[PDB]
Design a protein around this ligand. Structure first.
Ligand code: C2E
Ligand code: C2E
Ligand code: C2E
Ligand code: C2E
Ligand code: MG
Ligand code: MG
Lengths: 293, 293
């Protein structure tokens, strides 16, 4: 629906700007990269037109500077460039552009690339607004568990059952990743998920919930038993010997809030979440490797 | 990893064929469109290069002739054309091409489009290799529901709960489809799913299970109650006025087996299925529009 144009030159920028808004689209102008970021966060930006040559960085650090800025952490970025060279295309795609236009842009080759992007965007939008299984961990994703909670809660609240929910978080993940590699970052998330899978009952509802976030539902289980068993894992994880990108041993831990059990005084399913969260906050806020309830 | 090239001319085709397999890829040659289809079905084809000008059709019927042929019903198709004209791009994208390449093809602008496609393919592949709801109906899919049943069963068997499972089937679907169109076929499946969604509890686990198959789980529900409510729907569906091909009113019905309730005598979760099926058999075998248990 909504396109953001980055171009240092006012005339080149306002030409694109018209081609866009002529075809029922919403033009959004950016002087250079400062302004562009204040829009990406500020508004619901579908597609990005990026002059390779901006008043700060040359294209190929400039690309991933918009990727990082995005809410979902990916926008479709069309290169509007005067670069021509074969290997400038293959650099731009390599660096995570969605498309490449060689200036001068023709109106009806552009509109076709904007369509081609809006297509490949709705794909990213599904994968992140629906119940998929996360390939990496083998656990379901988060909008799964959002749905699954409200089911499992409504069931347990109608049929006077115990329902206890955990909310887990890997301790200083940003750091593990930044220090050992996006590779080892991933390698840990896996090894944690593996412990979670092995530790409980097929009846229990494990799920990845965010970057390093996880969520467990323990139907028919009370807050203390939930804590007891979750804590027992937290320990075994603590004691787990991982290898660094040097083949150095290192350990990692998670913080946990658990919440629910009874449910008489919990009305919303969204309240049962608020609690698990407040409790994960304290868990971290108090030196991390520990469960709170 | 595996690219299929359609070009009438042997020399143009085997030039592309080398550019491809030079970059660690798998070239697959097609004389014209007959041969190409015998490959799409025959093998795991990632990406398609399509000469616009082939010995039978002009590009724009030729495109959707490959779309239909695909197992998943969509491949990324890159247009190799000598057409230049603005509105030939805008036709090709409109008609469901993934990209447009202007002959003569340059090695290193091609390889960039093939990469751009393999990316937008792996996105389609995620959404369909992990992704638990059926698109069409918005219900849980089958691979999920097989897993979900064994969970919900193991839960109910551990915690002495009632668990009743339905298995539904639209009556003489083949006929509805053959008479009114693959269009109206689809349109009914939807309308049934919608009734199923509206009729029960958030707690209940509805799922599309095959062409015209559906499955419901009624946790905490006994075989009779399951039957009563499932039968109440079967009725309202019966009374539903659908519109044909022609805007003719027509009605449709479903057959149902329900099974479980107690679970003391049922060991496998796969047995709880066998029963629902045997009962759907009788339901149909005895003049269809009816539940059996
Ligand atoms: N969601 C969930 N809750 C868990 C899990 N492990 C323990 N709990 C909770 O903790 C309680 C006590 O566990 P326990 O003392 O070993 O008490 C258990 C234990 O001795 C045994 N038990 C139950 N299920 C199993 C099982 O699958 N394997 C084994 N080896 N023993 C089991 O029977 C006792 C019955 O206690 P319960 O009524 O199950 O009550 C359980 C349950 O409320 C788990 O993996 N998932
Ligand atoms: N300490 C403790 N551990 C628990 C408890 N619940 C589950 N676990 C652990 O989690 C594993 C998975 O149990 P499950 O998936 O419910 O599936 C279980 C369950 O369906 C059945 N089973 C085993 N022991 C019991 C039991 O005491 N009661 C019941 N009702 N089923 C059991 O056998 C399966 C595998 O048994 P395990 O090899 O023992 O494997 C169990 C056990 O190692 C619990 O309450 N306490
Ligand atoms: N999974 C599932 N099971 C179902 C459903 N409808 C009925 N049952 C089962 O069959 C019984 C029939 O409920 P009812 O005769 O409609 O009589 C119901 C009805 O008058 C009322 N009631 C129950 N659930 C609801 C509800 O969700 N909404 C409203 N408005 N009333 C409800 O309270 C009575 C108590 O019924 P129960 O003790 O629950 O016992 C229910 C339960 O055993 C359903 O849609 N899904
Ligand atoms: N006769 C009958 N109809 C059923 C039954 N189960 C589901 N339905 C129908 O489908 C809806 C199911 O609501 P829910 O998801 O169970 O979730 C329930 C629950 O959260 C609450 N609710 C409504 N009635 C009851 C009830 O009797 N007991 C409890 N515990 N909650 C109820 O409101 C929701 C549905 O409110 P409704 O407007 O009535 O909407 C109900 C109702 O018209 C059933 O057993 N019997
Ligand atoms: Mg400029
Ligand atoms: Mg030719």
């Amino acid at each position: 629906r909504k396109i953001l144009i980055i171009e240092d030159s006012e005339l080149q920028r306002k030409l694109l700007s018209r081609w866009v808004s002529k075809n029922g689209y919403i033009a959004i102008e950016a002087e250079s990269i400062s302004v562009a970021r204040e829009k990406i966060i500020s508004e619901s930006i579908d597609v990005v037109l990026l002059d390779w040559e901006l008043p700060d960085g040359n294209g190929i650090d400039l690309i991933s500077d918009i990727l990082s800025t995005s809410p979902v952490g990916w926008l479709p970025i069309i290169m509007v460039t005067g670069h021509t060279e074969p290997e400038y295309f293959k650099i731009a795609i390599e660096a995570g552009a969605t498309d490449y236009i060689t200036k001068p842009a023709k109106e009806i080759e552009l509109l076709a690339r904007i369509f081609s992007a809006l297509r490949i965007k709705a794909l990213h939008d599904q994968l992140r607004e629906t119940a998929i299984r996360d390939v990496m961990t083998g656990l379901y994703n988060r909008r799964y568990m959002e749905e699954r909670i409200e089911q499992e809660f409504q069931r347990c609240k109608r049929h006077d059952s115990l329902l206890s929910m955990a909310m887990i978080d890997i301790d200083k993940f940003k750091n593990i990743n930044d220090t050992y590699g996006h590779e080892i970052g991933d390698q840990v998330i896996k090894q944690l998920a593996h412990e979670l899978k092995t530790s409980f009952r097929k009846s229990d509802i494990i799920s990845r919930f965010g970057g390093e976030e996880f969520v467990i539902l323990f139907p028919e289980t009370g807050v203390v038993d939930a804590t007891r068993i979750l804590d027992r894992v937290r320990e075994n994880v603590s004691k787990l010997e991982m290898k660094s990108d040097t083949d150095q041993i290192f350990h990692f831990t998670f913080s946990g809030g658990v919440a629910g059990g009874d449910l008489s005084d919990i009305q919303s399913n969204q309240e049962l979440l608020k609690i698990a969260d407040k409790n994960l906050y304290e868990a971290k806020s108090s030196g991390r490797n520990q469960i709170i309830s």
